[PDB]
Amino acid sequence: EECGPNEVFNTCGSACAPTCAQPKTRICTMQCRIGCQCQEGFLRNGEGACVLPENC
């Protein structure tokens, strides 16, 4: 797991996790998502950068 700061790697995380665009998630489908994500308090920016929501 060589994610970034404030980021975490999950072998089963919200595939349609929330982001700077969609602060409201709701799963993408019947299948978790393996990869790095934004920790609780951070949002992923189009630039695949997990930046705080207050910094959006």
Side-chain angles (χ1 to χ4, degrees):
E1 60 219 291
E2 66 199 72
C3 320
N6 320 313
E7 313 160 25
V8 293
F9 202 123
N10 265 272
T11 35
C12 155
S14 23
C16 252
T19 67
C20 240
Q22 270 246 348
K24 316 230 251 126
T25 188
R26 61 121 207 167
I27 317 119
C28 227
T29 166
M30 217 161 132
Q31 228 152 323
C32 318
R33 167 269 202 157
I34 327 181
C36 295
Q37 44 218 242
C38 305
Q39 283 181 267
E40 210 220 72
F42 313 98
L43 294 182
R44 221 198 297 190
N45 81 336
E47 232 188 292
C50 280
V51 288
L52 286 119
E54 62 108 330
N55 243 321
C56 206

PDB file of all heavy atoms in Angstrom, residues 12 41-42:
ATOM      1  N   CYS A  12     -11.641  -3.828  -0.511  1.00  0.00           N
ATOM      2  CA  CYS A  12     -13.085  -3.888  -0.672  1.00  0.00           C
ATOM      3  C   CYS A  12     -13.682  -2.589  -0.127  1.00  0.00           C
ATOM      4  O   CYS A  12     -14.182  -2.554   0.995  1.00  0.00           O
ATOM      5  CB  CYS A  12     -13.680  -5.120   0.013  1.00  0.00           C
ATOM      6  SG  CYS A  12     -15.435  -4.951   0.506  1.00  0.00           S
ATOM      7  N   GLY A  41     -12.584  12.256   6.013  1.00  0.00           N
ATOM      8  CA  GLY A  41     -12.240  13.657   6.190  1.00  0.00           C
ATOM      9  C   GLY A  41     -11.522  14.206   4.956  1.00  0.00           C
ATOM     10  O   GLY A  41     -11.100  15.361   4.941  1.00  0.00           O
ATOM     11  N   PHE A  42     -11.407  13.353   3.949  1.00  0.00           N
ATOM     12  CA  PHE A  42     -10.747  13.738   2.712  1.00  0.00           C
ATOM     13  C   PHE A  42     -11.582  13.332   1.496  1.00  0.00           C
ATOM     14  O   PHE A  42     -12.336  12.361   1.552  1.00  0.00           O
ATOM     15  CB  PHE A  42      -9.410  12.996   2.668  1.00  0.00           C
ATOM     16  CG  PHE A  42      -8.612  13.074   3.971  1.00  0.00           C
ATOM     17  CD1 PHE A  42      -8.656  12.044   4.857  1.00  0.00           C
ATOM     18  CD2 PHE A  42      -7.860  14.172   4.243  1.00  0.00           C
ATOM     19  CE1 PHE A  42      -7.917  12.115   6.068  1.00  0.00           C
ATOM     20  CE2 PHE A  42      -7.119  14.244   5.453  1.00  0.00           C
ATOM     21  CZ  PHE A  42      -7.161  13.214   6.338  1.00  0.00           C
TER      22      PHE A  42
END
